[PDB]
Design a protein around this ligand. Sequence first.
Ligand SMILES: CC(=N)N1CCC(Oc2cc(C(=O)O)c3cc(C(C)C)n(Cc4ccc5ccc(C(=N)N)cc5c4)c3c2)CC1
Ligand SMILES: [Ca+2]
Length: 223
Amino acid sequence: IVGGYTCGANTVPYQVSLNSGYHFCGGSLINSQWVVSAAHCYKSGIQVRLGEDNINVVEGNEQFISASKSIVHPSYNSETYNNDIMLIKLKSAASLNSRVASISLPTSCASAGTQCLISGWGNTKSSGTSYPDVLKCLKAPILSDSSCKSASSFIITSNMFCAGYLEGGKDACQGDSGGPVVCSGKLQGIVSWGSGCAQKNKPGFYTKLCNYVSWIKQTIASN
Ligand SMILES: CC(=N)N1CCC(Oc2cc(C(=O)O)c3cc(C(C)C)n(Cc4ccc5ccc(C(=N)N)cc5c4)c3c2)CC1
Ligand SMILES: [Ca+2]
């Protein structure tokens, strides 16, 4: 997260860190047994870490649970990033309380102009590299699909939205991948891609989660 702020310990209780010997991606807890992240976060050997603030210190509210199964969306396209979404099942159910909590799925999509909360342990610099230990947060508005298409020279589908600041300076970044965009208490997005971070006319792009609720619900119901 570039140009954001320290969230505060456990203030984003659905935020997870995916760990393979080190933090590599974020995710969102959607019930006691399932996390949603980005398909581009797929790898084997995933441990889900819940209840994290400082990812380098055991502070006492963590739950570390191995993944039993990962399911990348059947139509994920790694060249265009279309359908950048993956479900991860936990080997055991997480214990839910104030510091570890699921985030509601949307019943309708979010509108352009709404300020949403984006969070992660990604790079905090637009030019350099600096990775934080504690969770960072950013409020950013959803931009119109037309604005997003005007800015970018890459493929943008109806399964993506963009959010952020066309002037630059505030954005998600590498290491925030897979993490949440929450708007009015609903998980509306997954950190998916961007041309650099916080650069002028290169906003963040996000998987448009509202398009996937049926797939999420049926996949969970049958697995
Ligand atoms: C859509 C498409 N097919 N394409 C072609 C390939 C391009 O891939 C690039 C281009 C560039 C570039 O410099 O232009 C960079 C720079 C970086 C690092 C060093 C920061 N990465 C890795 C990265 C990883 C995750 C991110 C997650 C989120 C956001 C964000 N801004 N919200 C940025 C992210 C950036 C990049 C990935 C993207 C456009
Ligand atoms: Ca910790």
